[PDB]
Paper text:
Class A plexins (PlxnAs) act as semaphorin receptors and control diverse aspects of nervous system development and plasticity, ranging from axon guidance and neuron migration to synaptic organization. Plexins are large type 1 transmembrane proteins comprising typically ten domains in their extracellular segment, a single membrane spanning region that is predicted to be helical and a conserved, cytoplasmic region that contains a GTPase-activating protein (GAP) domain with a Rho GTPase-binding domain insert. All our PlxnA ectodomain structures show autoinhibitory, intermolecular “head-to-stalk” (domain 1 to domain 4-5) interactions, which are confirmed by biophysical assays, live cell fluorescence microscopy, and cell-based and neuronal growth cone collapse assays. This work reveals a 2-fold role of the PlxnA ectodomains: imposing a pre-signaling autoinhibitory separation for the cytoplasmic domains via intermolecular head-to-stalk interactions and supporting dimerization-based PlxnA activation upon ligand binding.
We determined crystal structures of the full extracellular segments of mouse PlxnA1, PlxnA2, and PlxnA4 from eight crystal forms providing a total of 13 independent structures that range in maximum resolution from 4 to 10 Å. In five out of 13 full extracellular structures all ten domains are resolved whereas in the other eight structures some of the C-terminal domains were not modeled due to fragmentary or absent electron density. Some flexibility in the stalk is evident on comparison of the 13 different structures and contributes to the ring diameter ranging from 84 Å to 99 Å. All our PlxnA full ectodomain crystal structures have an intermolecular plexin–plexin interface in common. The residues in this interface are conserved among vertebrate PlxnAs but much less among all plexins, suggesting that this plexin–plexin interaction may be an important functional feature of PlxnAs.
Residue numbers in the entry:
A (entry chain A): 37 to 1036
B (entry chain B): 37 to 951
Write the structure that this text describes.
Amino acid sequence: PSFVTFRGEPAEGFNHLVVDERTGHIYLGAVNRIYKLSSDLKVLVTHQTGPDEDNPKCYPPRIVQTCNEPLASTNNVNKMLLIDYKENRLIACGSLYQGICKLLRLEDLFKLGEPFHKKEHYLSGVNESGSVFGVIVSYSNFDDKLFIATAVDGKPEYFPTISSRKLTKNSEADGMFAYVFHDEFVASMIKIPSDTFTVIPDFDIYYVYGFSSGNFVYFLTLQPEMVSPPGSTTKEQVYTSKLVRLCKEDTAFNSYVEVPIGCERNGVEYRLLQAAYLSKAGAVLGRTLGVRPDDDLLFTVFSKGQKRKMKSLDESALCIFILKQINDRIKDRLQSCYRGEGTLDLAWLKVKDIPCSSALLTIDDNFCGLDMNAPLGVSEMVRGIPVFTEDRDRMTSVIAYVYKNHSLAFVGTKSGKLKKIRVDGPKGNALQYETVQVVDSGPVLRDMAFSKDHEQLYIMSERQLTRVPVESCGQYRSCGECLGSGDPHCGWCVLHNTCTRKERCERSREPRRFASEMKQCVRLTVHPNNISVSQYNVLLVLETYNVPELSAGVNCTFEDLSEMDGLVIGNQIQCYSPAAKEVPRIITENGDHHVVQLQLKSKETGMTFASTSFVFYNCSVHNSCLSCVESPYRCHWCKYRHVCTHDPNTCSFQEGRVKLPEDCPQLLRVDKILVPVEVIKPITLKAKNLPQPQSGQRGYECILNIQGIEQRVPALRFNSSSVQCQNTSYSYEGMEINNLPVELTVVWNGHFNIDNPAQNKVYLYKCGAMRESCGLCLKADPDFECGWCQSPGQCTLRQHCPAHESRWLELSGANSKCTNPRITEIIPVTGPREGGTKVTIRGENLGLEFRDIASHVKVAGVECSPLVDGYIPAEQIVCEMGEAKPSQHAGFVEICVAVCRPEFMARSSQLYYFMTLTLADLKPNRGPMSGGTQVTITGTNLNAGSNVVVMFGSQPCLFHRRSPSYIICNTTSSEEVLDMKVTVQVDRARIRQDLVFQYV
Amino acid sequence: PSFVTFRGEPAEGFNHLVVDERTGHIYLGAVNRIYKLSSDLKVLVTHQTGPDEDNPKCYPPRIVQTCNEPLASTNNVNKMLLIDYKENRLIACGSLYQGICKLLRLEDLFKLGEPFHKKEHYLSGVNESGSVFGVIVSYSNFDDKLFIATAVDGKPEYFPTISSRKLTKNSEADGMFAYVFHDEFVASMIKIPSDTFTVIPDFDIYYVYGFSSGNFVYFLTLQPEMVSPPGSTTKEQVYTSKLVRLCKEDTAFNSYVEVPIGCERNGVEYRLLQAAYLSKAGAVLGRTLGVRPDDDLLFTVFSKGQKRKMKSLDESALCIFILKQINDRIKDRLQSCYRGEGTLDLAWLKVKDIPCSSALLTIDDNFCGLDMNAPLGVSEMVRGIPVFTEDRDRMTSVIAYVYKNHSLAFVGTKSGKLKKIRVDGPKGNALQYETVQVVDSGPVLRDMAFSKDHEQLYIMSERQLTRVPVESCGQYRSCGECLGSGDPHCGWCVLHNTCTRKERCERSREPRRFASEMKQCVRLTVHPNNISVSQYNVLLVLETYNVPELSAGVNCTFEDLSEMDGLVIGNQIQCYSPAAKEVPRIITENGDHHVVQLQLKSKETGMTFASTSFVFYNCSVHNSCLSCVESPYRCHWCKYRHVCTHDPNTCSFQEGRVKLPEDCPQLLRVDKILVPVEVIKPITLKAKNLPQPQSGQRGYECILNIQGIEQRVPALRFNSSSVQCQNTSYSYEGMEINNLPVELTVVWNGHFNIDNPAQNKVYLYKCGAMRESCGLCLKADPDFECGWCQSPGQCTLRQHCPAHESRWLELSGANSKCTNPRITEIIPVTGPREGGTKVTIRGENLGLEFRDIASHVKVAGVECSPLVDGYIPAEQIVCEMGEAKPSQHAGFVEICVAVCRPEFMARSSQLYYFM
């Protein structure tokens, strides 16, 4: 939705706004223009007040007398605007005339009159807008007048800052703007003294806001540095914001009072008034405030500090004053002066301090002021009660009103936004909402008025007027959300199922028709929360609370899908579930269950207000016993029918029903099922609650899901808990993998698959696909019964290998030597003569125990000692060679399993070579002291032996890789010093040489 | 249009005229000529009757016997003319033959015969025309005759004045003009007795008019003084006009009767017949006259008094006689004689009075006369009913006729004009029209006859015959004029838009087609009389009365500008106004309003007959409030818009409307606005209904229109009735004139000038351009406040002169003595020594009061006394010098203002000289 607005009809400018209480027409003061608009902000009429040839310096403007100074077309700013209902007109006081005032007719804006001739007719030279304010007060004839305050600009002789002036019936009449009582000695006006001007050059009083209360007139003002801040001579100007008051009845002007005003937040001072608004509290605020219904309140806005009235600070605070409290402060002050204590203390007015005179008097609120102890100031600054503070974006303006007793406050911001604040000190809370009806880039003005009907709030900007509704609750879809937002205007119109204000809800006055608090929402419950898909037209009872009288009629709508009529009895609603024809259309593809939001559609509104979680659950869809029972819902499984249903009767017969998950027909696990390929073997199974096949039903089968071949073997069900597939052999083609797990499915009557929770599988394993060597087979589990068969040179079960001889060989309990050891290949081919090398020998048919191999290994003559941890049985032996000093140079490797028997020994195909490695040169000769240099050691036979260590300066080098020609290592820090020697030690041999490494 | 006429074909002369009933041919008797003319007055044929060698004195003219007296070629005057239809000829009796008569053939004017031989063939020596008359009466054969009367000229033996004569079929026949019955004792003729001639030498009977009526023959005659007026011996002759009558049937001539006739108007006597005409009354006159249809009437014309038959008086009166009334007078007279009372009383005929004899008789109208109490006269003169009298221009002739029962009378005048008179004694009214068809300078003759068709009336003059239409209504342009003339023939042929007779108007019989009375002329009204310029095609209803059936079709034409079709319903016509496009073309430049004559154009004729005042009213043109409201029309002024408009709504707003003139905006006058040059002064003004300037409107200014410099000074409007220009000074360059009035215009909002009805002005005045002397300034009005300032030697306001001393001098109320008197010049330079001279001395700086100057003046030693009235203060002194007898001869003039102080005296530049 967009907000209705009026763009600066003169796109050029804007200054003041006011609303006519009866009509709702909105009048807008502006520079060079005054507009009359409809409530909708349509342009009713435009008046041209503007550009006049003039000059501020000239006194009586050009029309009255000739001015030496040159004139220029200048803009006439609407300083003030006030509606005079009685007169049926508008006082629209401008400037640039020496401040001549104009009278515009209410309906047409016809200029009734604009008195220029006399001195009184001129208000002030001041060009600034809003620095002026005032009130129009009227009574029947022979009782009446206008109170207005304006800045002087140092014009003290020409104009009075505050005055009490006359407003005659005839706009033509000369008398206008004349002082109510003029005497040579005293006139109903207050001028600024010349002495005060000389002392402080710039002193001026700017009047922000003004209002009539009871029988007085108050003004919120800004003044200069006078004893504040202290200063010997002129320099900087800071302002003090004060409150002023007058009796309406005092022609003498004796009643004048002036108290400084502000408020502080946690040690932060807020001295400067931006705007104010007098209003009522309403029952809520008033009660906790402790006020009478009639008592008034004053919302205000202040900026931080005393500095720069022209351009104030962002920091701003909304404070509050109860009029009773201010009245007390004034009465308190007066009762004091009457005591005779102290001075009057009003710096700008009276330079020389006059003392207060004591006197006997009954000091009342009615007190209008007396001749002695005449106009007076105030010592104690009146503090206000803080409400909301904005640091980031300065508040510009404020308004407030009573709504259903709750007090709503409106606050303009520098940004062009409005805040809707419920004041709850007297209640309990804070800011409800913020809105940007206005103008996204830049600010709002003090003239912000609510409409007469109080539906909207016209918000004025420099550029445009915007009709911001005090309420747009419609945005809220649900009772939970509506009441959730908290912006006080919104309530849940239960029957309408919409969110709006009290006025908007038809028949909201009636009970439970309208909901204010979340508790009131609507709460709904359905007795049969869960209904099965199979059921149809089931009776449901609805319990609803906090709902208005439904006698209009109600319908139950499960969703957009269906709607059934309902009848009301007691405090309940009775509706029926949908038909089976209707229910499954929903259920399809949702499967297990579908929660649906059952709503209530009211007959009068026709909108769904209340909802509940309604479950459609259908047992039949479940394909298996586990899903049926084990699932989350109440469903029964029929073992025989093999169908899941809600009704017990539907099952085949009594013994057939499955209520509990344990009872489901399922296969229990046993020790792993091992199955050799090509062997005829039975496979016994255990299980529970296996059904006895009924008439027209076949027996059990075992189905193995092997990708290569799927086997169907019939089986026998011995009892409710045991099964067995008949003697058969299984195979898979490929010989790719030794152990292949296979899923097995037990079926009966052809299709019926018994549940397998564990998902037990059959392991098909093949006699040595994996083991070519006798040592490997005997190594494997004794369970397999797989063993080595000598004649074939292969390994299989006894069943599998023919017995020419009485025996096929099986490790009886490891007491089985395994023959013809062979050596495939060994690592480090070469080694150092000194020894210490770790030889890694890899063979096929070695000894099973370490103890036998130890002492077995020999390299030629040289004794080699094997390592236990390193040794992997019958596959590999890691052995460390001893001292090689012998004459051989190169020799074959021999392993004798236990004993060096002729059958029992193995010799290496290629011989182990012994060598004296030498090093010629280093790739980098030099490197930094810190080290970390990649050294390239070149030489011959560098690969020999087991261990290698490189030492530069006896400090170790970090080894990387080794080769026959090359050794690569990273240098250590030569903490020692520049230069150094290189020692390489392989095993017991330590070789050195002339090649040196130089540290740089 | 011009009237058809026949000029004296003989340009030389003219005498008688007659019209042939069947043909319409007009025969005209003249001297030496007889003409036959067409109805149109074209010349058909001319006959030469004229100049014959002859002599009046000779009896049987030269042809019969030789005459001793010398002959001379003389003119033959046509004495008489009579149409003999039966005979198919014209009897045209001449003179100069001893009055031989001629017979001219009807068609060709071929002379059938002219009997000269016998005595009867000679009628009378008398040369005068028109003194003769008579009638031709005819019947089938063996019944017939001619009755003719003529003057004798003292020829009593030769010719009979009245006779009954024979008219034979053959013009050649000898018998012609023989007496019907001739006996030795009595013949059908009446002669004048010789005795009567001796007594009165000149006696003669002149016969003016004659006509046959019923079965008688009447003659209107003029006779001499016989017992009237009484006179012992001959001297002067006056005439008595009488009526004569005879039975057609009386061969004996016993029936002769003779009554004097005349009429009187308010004690004025009209005795002499100029002409007469027998006619019918028609239904109108007859009814109120109380007559039968057949009964006749006799219109006549008489001059005042008994004097000069040869040249009668201008005063003349048209009288009337009903034949029944005259017949009664005659019967009454006869029944009386038969009573045996009195004498016959006929002076000229019977010198010795014979008595009437009584006898038993049934006296009827039929009575033809008897042997005893034979021809007789009459005592009681028969009076006639007067009709019209002309004092200035004498009536000469008359005719009358019946038209649609109204009786129209025609009367010739000495001037050559014809009057068309409806006689309405029996009806009610007088003379309708006068015409000069004839001859503008000089008169018309008795022979005036209407045509057979009665379309025209041939009017004869000495010089020319003129065909005057009875009717020539075409001359009249408008219904108002047509019916205005009153000559009864004319009516307004509405659709034709012309003026003519009933016969001439086609379809006049139909209703409202023809208008007889002015009332009938056309009256038109339009319901929406006033329509605004802004409006277009407005429905208008037309009310017309006295109009013929329009079903032919009608169009509405506002003027020559536009024309809109109309439809007829009821007794109204509905037309539409013109479009806005059309209406303003007219309105432009007429301004306030334009009255237009909306006419109706008839479809059949195509001429606009009826009109009305139609108003187009444009308010907008009015520039000011006064013109808008104060003017003559309904217009409203909008104070705020400052525009004038017809619609109230158009004004800015309700409070802004100006309906009344008082409410406007105008400047009221105050005592004259005096403005000194070079002085800062405010000028307060008074006024009424000054507007309060509305939004977007500026304030008031005072603009002075001074040719040298125009000043714009802003002002303040205190209230609806007062203004004031701000402190300023004004000047004009030139120093030419002291008092300069200047027009001032008060304006607001720049251009808007407030109305200034009085046209009040500001008087800019500047202190003595005119007065070099202290005496002159103090003399001037106290109002100016201008006064003499001693130190400067000049004169200006106090404001203008610095006060070293407490005073500048102003005549407080004339109590202010004034220095240095001078004498420019004095009049009478010279004077007599004796004195008494009035010396007029003109100077510059004299005394303010007379009392001081008196005794001041001296001419040298001689004391001179000044005159109060003559003395104009400080400018001039009029003084009278005393006795100069002193030795000086010449001396200088001296004036001492109050006292002859050394500073205070003035002496003349040039001296006064005594001689």
